[model samples]
Target chain A: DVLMTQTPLSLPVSLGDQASISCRSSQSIVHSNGNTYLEWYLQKPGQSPKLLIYKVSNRFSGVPDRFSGSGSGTDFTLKISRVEAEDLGVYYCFQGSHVPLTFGAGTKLELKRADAAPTVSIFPPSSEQLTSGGASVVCFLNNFYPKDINVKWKIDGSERQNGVLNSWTDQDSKDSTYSMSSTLTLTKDEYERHNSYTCEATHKTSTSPIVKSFNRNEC
Target chain B: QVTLKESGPGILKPSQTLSLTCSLSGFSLRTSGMGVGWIRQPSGKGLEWLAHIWWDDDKNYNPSLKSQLTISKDTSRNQVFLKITSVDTADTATYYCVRRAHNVVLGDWFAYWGQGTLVTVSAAKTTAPSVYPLAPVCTTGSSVTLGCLVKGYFPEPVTLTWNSGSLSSGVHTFPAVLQSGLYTLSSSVTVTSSTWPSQSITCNVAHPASSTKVDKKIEPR
Candidate 1:
């Protein structure tokens, strides 16, 4: 079974702007028949899935000029130029080259409504990590609008070097709010110093940084 | 906005010709310059793309169904049609007629799908599924495997479920095998436990042909 992975589960785009969704297959979708069976479909709310691009890059019948596809082998991209109101929905890439057909986890195409910032919350790591003289903390950012967001870690109000892995944003199916996570792991000495760990989140919706702080004592 | 609804005989005997029609509204097959195709799904099976044809006479059929499948259209009546010959129980399925769309291109995608029509094929009378516990149902050990045989079902499609929640993930249901016009299949569910009630795990089977629901509870005393 081939797995198709898609990025940016939630996309916030303005009308008349270009939008792109990426789809990658675990295996080559090219069949021995000399055909790449990867196809793209747009499913609007309350409507059946509509084909946009088939065979990788060819536009489907009656599809507008603005929608195009490009990619090869395992990676593909579907781009919509001048996205319209009707295009606000979910996009999925499907592969038919194999015996068991596979579909992508849909990427929701959302229309930009207004600036909404994420509510940032930090979770203290297990005391087990501190027992080994190394500790970790996590910042969970939820209820945000638009896919664009950034997270940073600060120890004792000073910049903690990057390597704090940030995960991809996940969208709330009902509300379309985006959520993501960030992690920070360092020597437990930082906590032994009673260092104040802070998670700062930045988004287009807010002018000021959204910050959440935690410490070993708090745990 | 094109609406296509399909209709066909609901019952068929072996070696019979299965004829079906796709009634269309909101678009002309000739003027729209689109192709129409048939897609079918046997009960509890994956989808099967049967055939497609364009108004201009260009057509394609799935190689597997090519020999016995005929795809044609009537533009004047704004309809598409298909015929499958030598039908059997395997041919039983809900057939859908879908309007085709392309970028003035070779490959086609389904644009409009009609309400599918159910078609069943069987030369024999409907029979309910008979399920029985397999011999030596379990191994008394750290883990136990419960097995059962589901047989004597015609016009295939059966539903199976386990009584235990944890047992659901450790189940293996084999594909149905047909012999002498009857179907037989087997399944097993495994669990790890020091001890559990021997009759606690119930295998439920729902066979729709005769609207029969049967259960074969496994006891490995």
Candidate 2:
């Protein structure tokens, strides 16, 4: 495999903006014919990939002038001018000069939103359980932008000292919003006390913590 | 990216075997599920679909050449081989190596071409016409005009087609004009205007006298 790497895993662009993605190959792709076999492709959210730039810098037939490619050897660039909403999608750089035909990791271009807040919800295990020989509750922080958030847990207006675990964040392929699961555990005796468990996440989308809570009232 | 090139013997003997190798870079043969093909464009015949090495390593060959053809690959060396036996003057032509894309709804298309390596038994220079796609010219905002000039062809008779399926309308192909015993023809296509050059416009020129077909691709400026 040629190991094709692209930059800016996720890009946020406003309308009428310009975007450029770079693709670098592990080896120089200059062919014996003096042509670089690099190509740029745009894949709509669910549509098949379409060729945009071919042979380094030549736009594929009918491609608008706003889409251009340039560079040579192991380094190449794909630029989009006058970015439109229709241009939001994953852009990939492919190398045909390599044996197996390798494709670079994609760089997703998305519309920049004003700000999106996380949808916070807290609940017990899918099937009621003392999963860790303790009361187990799951806090969901769903659909937020920028992908970073801080979580704090509270037990009956106090703080959680232990048994708190958070899962890695997940970003939606189409929406670019983030989601994560934070699990809090309490002793079975304390759980029967019916004390409330609070899940709060701090994010740039809002001024105060986004909060949700759950208690043995439902379990 | 895959960098591929064709290598082979340039001159051939009437009764000797002809061997050609396709060397590839940027990928290894051991791990990929891709296939290679060999096409022969002879001096006096249309392109011959010679052979294909299927992605799974299965082999297929032209019935006409089946008696004398073989295709193989070196997994460790990242190369594919094309060898034909008992060559004749009829076998003299430029051989090309290509990458094949297969399957229904998507079957039978070559994504990559080797630019062909000529294996000749020639006595004089007889060549196909070269196709040139000139920049577009205009007379109206109602429609855009693109030109194609087929030039420097021998023995008359060239078939040209505007590839976007009759090219929408308004196409004029002038008669082939003689120059230095060769033929040259000019053709133009007028297409409806778009916000900008949206896709490629192509002209395919086929010179049957020399079994050569060349296409000129124009990117609207």
Candidate 3:
């Protein structure tokens, strides 16, 4: 049986930082013709597994530039730079060189909490038809820390509890921070009046709330 | 990037075989210079290597599972298939389809992986045997007799054997007493007193419903 010796069962990574994991095989992964067979994978929480590297160093298509792989024969390493909030999950190394292919146990990446805050973006208000009662606006907060941030909706500088608000957190492929999203519905009158809508994110890391504004006239 | 999606049954009964297919996209099975493999992980347990199949049809399997596992690829459909027979509860796991990155001469590693499909084996319908060896009794003729009792296994097809100090001790297993959904069996070994005192007799009981062998040992008086 082939064996993969994976070290460091878990790693805590910071935003804009780097992390490395190593996998050492019990036998040479080089085939008789001299090509080494080793690959790396990441299993994001509640999502399908994704391939990051193949043939030791070649990056899979569409993978970000931050994720890279290198090594040969029996030793291999996967490194990620500028770790993003979504990169938290279990990483595995698998060998296909011989019968009974084997896998390195697994390593998990966790988010390091600090002062890094989320970037907020507002999607332009959209309507199904003028007859439809209201338009929906969604605000997305990305690359945030602590997974404990609050979002609120305000129209024309007045807090509007009547508007539906929802927020949830997700991890990115590069780091293990929290990204949140919220959606608000506004009546047709408010839409036609070109009202100023603001999404405010309140977090413990900030002295005051961070806000993003969407003006209907701008749309 | 190439992607693999696995499809299969979520539940299996004992003695039933499982067939799973993995569909691939954005990649050609033959031109990618890669093989496809199957790996599985039991609930909350580590990964277990099952089998691998090359594009050209070359294959390899885990020795323990080699007897019942079949890994095959379909180039025309860009799919890989897994077939496992004589399954038990221990075979329940989340199976994944993976791309085997390698050269023409040897297979290397799995570079791509599909989301896993969980397959569970139901043991509610199965039963396994228990074995025990009775104490040895010395006879008047300088001989000792040992009895091994196997009881309560189900689904038929049981085999009982014996071993003692690296030697095959039991002569034969007598006919089993069959009951409703159960069985009781016994086997015996007779050895000279001189040899019986120095060795320990072991009874190995096996049944089709379970892959593990149930063994019981007894020391001679």
Give the alpha carbon lDDT tens digit for every residue of B43-122 in model 2.
Answer: 32334567778656888776667889999988678789999998876787778777653342222234556667888542
User: Residues B97-202, candidate 1, lDDT per residue (tens digit)?
Assistant: 8776533353355656666899988776777766665323112356555555565588778878777334576455655655446665555565665444644777
Cα lDDT tens digits, model 1, A80-167, are 8788878887788878777445667788888675556875556554443456565556665655777688788888888887546555
> Per-residue CA lDDT of candidate 3, range A4-89, in tens?
98877767776679899999998898866666768788887765567788778877768898999998778899999778867878
Q: List, for all models, the DockQ compared with the true complex.
A: 0.04, 0.01, 0.12
My TM-score estimates for the predictions, one after another, are: 0.46, 0.42, 0.50
Off by over 4 Å in 3: A113-219, B1-5, B23-34, B73-79, B101-112, B125-221
Full ranking by TM-score: 3, 1, 2
Per residue, candidate 3 scores C-alpha lDDT tens digits across B21-55 of: 99999777785457887888874456778887766
Docking class of 1: incorrect
Task: Supply the DockQ value of model 1.
Answer: 0.04
True-structure RMSD, every candidate: 18.4, 26.6, 31.1
Docking class of 2: incorrect
Task: Tell me candidate 3's interface RMSD.
Answer: 32.7
Q: Model 2 over residues A1-219: C-alpha lDDT tens digits?
A: 566888876788877999988888988877666667787777664344567777788775577899989987888888998898788878878766545556677787877765678766555432223443445555656667777689988988887857765554334546656666565656666776756778898999788987876565643
In terms of lDDT, which candidate is strongest? 1
